[PDB]
């Protein structure tokens with residue numbers, strides 16, 4: 001994943017737990033070499049998985065819990081770190097934003113050549129609910145999607161309830177979330 005993702009994880013941890021904790025995580029993750037992350041540079045996906053595993057051990061939180069928190073954080077981090085207009089352009093309500101997500105990542109992918117974005121498809125079931133299909137080249141990031149959706153709820157001052165109804169882990173084709181919103 002691009003350095004931007006790893007910087008945001010670093011930022012989230014460093015802000016909540018301080019630099020010493022960050023340095024321990026960095027060390028345990030096997031990254032003491034890397035002096036800083038470069039936002040627009042591509043890293044091995046392993047860098048991100050190791051950082052998360054190491055943060056889990058050092059902080060004593062399951063990795064999935066940290067992914068949820070990171071998902072929520074990302075919505076705020078991107079708005080403040082160069083992508084606030086891009087976010088605004090993706091809509092002014094939760095359901096519209098989710099319809100625009102693939103288009104938003106298409107736009108991101110202009111600037112980030114090697115992007116491997118997720119694919120999201122919405123099947124609306126009412127004016128207050130939708131099924132969200134999430135497909136990815138990567139494993140284990142469904143909890144991050146959960147936090148993202150909650151971050152977007154906060155963004156749009158909209159109450160949202162998100163329940164995953166299909167899990168790749170149980171052998172399903174892809175993750176599916178049932179979403180209800182104000």
Ligand code: HEM
Nearest residue numbers: 001002078083086087108115116117118136137138145148
């Ligand atoms: C303007 C705001 C955003 C920017 C700049 C951005 C950019 C990125 C970047 C660089 C990656 C890494 C992919 C790679 O390195 O190949 C990524 C991944 C991801 N993004 Fe976005 N993103 C934004 C908003 C969102 C939002 C709002 C969501 C909410 C659903 C989202 C969902 C995801 C997920 C689930 C991944 C994990 C990659 C995967 O599943 O394969 N992104 N995004």
